[PDB]
């Protein structure tokens, strides 16, 4: 029933009915990635690209029993012509901040994959199944860079109900520990953008706190109020409301009591948590007590898509992250 | 199946099979309270005591159509003999900090009710259906005082599954905005005490964060680590583990990966949130997405029970708060 869930599911269906997104995987020496890749290919859901030495990977894959059939492999220590083009695009963008030995730094698979995405030789980078989160985010920031107007890298989970309910987007549950009011607005605004791009629905953003309207008064509350004002000036046609408790944001009967003038009317589909504690704990409560599947998260704030998996991810998590990452078109 | 839920439900059943707890209601001029009171009486689940002028209350109740039959009413502007005894008990406890006109301050229904509980003329005070939370907590602190060894007033929700699942205790989701490590330990230790008293089960306490083991490093994380060390020194036979993410605390397969030496083994029944943001948002996610009923919350840290309802509470919320508040025996 929720048009946002309907739209997500059907948009992933339809990946097979249009030209495939090229999804680059730099942590390729991982049987989960090989399996995810082979599935994507077999189902015509995407064009996977594995970043590795093809001799090393072939030996790897043969020893783990995974079918390599039809999968593009690209060696980041070869492809000098390409790495020269990436070095040049990096210089042009980053300027004085461009390392020398850029050419060598680009032989790192994460960097090479980031540079492909940045240059449009791939559409999406998915990494982090082997590489540390710090490394994956560092590569993305260095090679892809921030989105213009966004000074903050954040993440958003797509919360998809198993049992029954709405799809929601839960942000920042992974990256920024204690957002400033300006960061919180960066997160809000990026989340809206991500939500629209994936779902086709118009974001209805709630800035969460322990207060609704000014029901409480504390520096915590003010940071969220400040963020809300910033969001409204930056994006004056966004549907948003701020400091709201979860129930005021999500339950129309409660919004009626606690926040009657609220333009969300208790129908927020995007929740912006005030801190990593609240977000990280909260989406996990949503998944474990609520039966929600938490897809991703999707990294946001970058000029092009590069996402970070958990080192402990499953094959299925990789697949579903690739699918939602590929939908924005 | 969960022995803690089984025990809660059956202990509320059995309230009718033993001598009733005297539950005092100082916000008596409220038809919800009159209804809750009359139900408790009719079901022999408790002995309600209404604090009000009996002429005023009789007129009130007659005009709202609520049956007053068999309900004790006590006038806080009368009962000088009693108020003198309360004044004297207050002087003995508080000493130099005892107001003059104590005798007059005790004619305030909240104060009179707090003084009855403190003196054992009642077992439990339930207030806040009309009075502000600040007023209810202020009365309790002034007349009842803190529990010895506890320097912090906090609250705990009993999270009871509708659909299926374990009962859990979620603390501080209402009172303390940003607990210090020492406050967080006060909250932990009081929560355990509350949990044992209500359920009969032995508390298994998780100190929640966005990190599990030292998976992250941030002042936020350290505050929870510090709290955990304090809890362990203060209560060396408590089952507790600290900084854990929600999933590491609650999901044995996850605890195995993220925190293998954890003595919770992913079977925490008491979660101590690191902040009001996280707790307030979190229990609301648990109720709204998870189908949990959030009973209370129960105020803790006081020398005797005085609890605070929402001004917007339902009759049923009052009843169920009275019932769980009455179980500890």
Shape of chain A: globular
Q: What is the helix tally of chain A?
A: 13
- How many DSSP-defined strands of chain A? 11
What are the secondary-structure elements of chain A, in order, as H or E?
A: HEHEHEHHHEHEEHEHEHHEHEEH
CATH fold name of the largest domain in chain A, please? Rossmann fold
User: Architecture of the largest domain in chain A, according to CATH?
Assistant: 3-Layer(aba) Sandwich
> Number of domains in the coordinates of chain A?
2
Give the termini distance of chain A in whole angstroms: 24 Å
Q: Main interface pair?
A: A-B, 34 and 34 residues
Fraction of helical residues of chain A = 40-55%
The oligomeric state is: homodimer
